[PDB]
């Protein structure tokens, strides 16, 4: 129950439960498959 009118006044947000490290761990242009050779 929100007792207040504005959105800033609500409690903390709830877990992204998004999670996708590939923008950080695999930003390569041509896709690399694990097990296939790195450099062909």
């Amino acid at each position: 129950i929100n007792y207040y009118k504005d959105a800033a006044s609500t409690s903390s947000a709830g877990q992204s439960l998004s999670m996708d490290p590939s923008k950080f761990t695999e930003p390569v242009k041509d896709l690399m498959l694990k097990g296939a050779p790195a450099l062909n």
Binding site: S22, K23, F24, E26, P27, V28, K29, D30, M32, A38, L39, N40
Partner: protein, 255 residues
């Protein structure tokens, strides 16, 4: 017979071929794109010179020697004088751009050495004076020359200590930023595609640089016996999806 290894990038009226690549990085897995309306604020129609600004400019070459500490260029600064890209830059109030960066360094199968090529969004430098000394404008706008981390402290300039990234963080952790290594034994180029990253939809191209490109020797250059002890490093950079807005009189900037 496609290898990760050979590549061709054609952009505008200029083409680059590498026969010894190590894939290419696209920052944060996003490719440069123009500014959508839903994200727009300034009401001005923007100008998109296209092929006259989105081509490859090769900056002047550096020389890696056994004593090198590393070099640093800022964008869009490094290009402030390249062809029509630069003119547009001084003539509009606002502009926006992504880039393809291609760093080149070839040697032979007897050399060793490994450079880190990294792009740091919003690289705010530190004053070597400490306290709250600022880093004057000119010092953070070296132009095509870039900053040479093995040059001496100057007054009003930034600190040039490598194991601290010019800001109080350790060299070892720069790997959290989009980056690629050039290991003479593997690699001969590094290519990074940079999407436009800012907290505003479009900004000023002269009062704010939005990425520093940094090339840092990490495993020292080691040449074969009685080889000349140095290799040149060349940086070629191409603006991509550039847009300029708010045209007028032509900025005058310090120094």
């Amino acid at each position: 017979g496609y290898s990760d290894r050979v590549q061709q990038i054609t952009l505008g009226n200029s083409t680059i071929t590498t026969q010894e690549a190590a894939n290419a990085v696209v920052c944060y897995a996003e490719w440069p794109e123009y500014l959508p309306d839903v994200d727009a604020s300034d009401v001005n129609k923007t100008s998109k010179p296209d092929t006259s600004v989105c081509r490859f400019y090769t900056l002047d070459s550096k020389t890696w020697t056994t004593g090198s500490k590393g070099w640093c260029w800022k964008l869009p600064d490094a290009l402030k004088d390249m062809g029509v890209f630069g003119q547009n830059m001084f003539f509009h109030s606002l502009g926006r751009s992504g880039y393809t960066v291609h760093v080149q360094c070839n040697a032979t199968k007897f050399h060793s050495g490994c450079l880190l090529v990294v792009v740091i969004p919003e690289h705010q430098l530190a004053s070597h004076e400490g306290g709250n000394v600022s880093v004057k404008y000119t010092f953070t706008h070296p132009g095509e020359r870039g900053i040479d981390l093995s040059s001496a402290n100057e007054v009003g300039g930034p600190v040039k200590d490598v194991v601290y990234n010019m800001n109080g963080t350790l060299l070892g952790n720069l790997l959290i930023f989009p980056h690629q290594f050039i290991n003479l034994r593997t690699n001969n180029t590094a290519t990074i595609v940079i999407p436009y990253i800012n907290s505003v939809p479009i900004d000023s191209m002269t009062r704010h640089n939005n990425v520093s490109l940094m090339v840092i020797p990490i495993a020292p250059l080691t040449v074969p016996t009685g080889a000349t002890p140095s290799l040149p490093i060349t940086v070629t950079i191409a603006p991509m999806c550039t847009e300029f807005s708010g045209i007028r009189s032509k900025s005058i900037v310090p120094q």
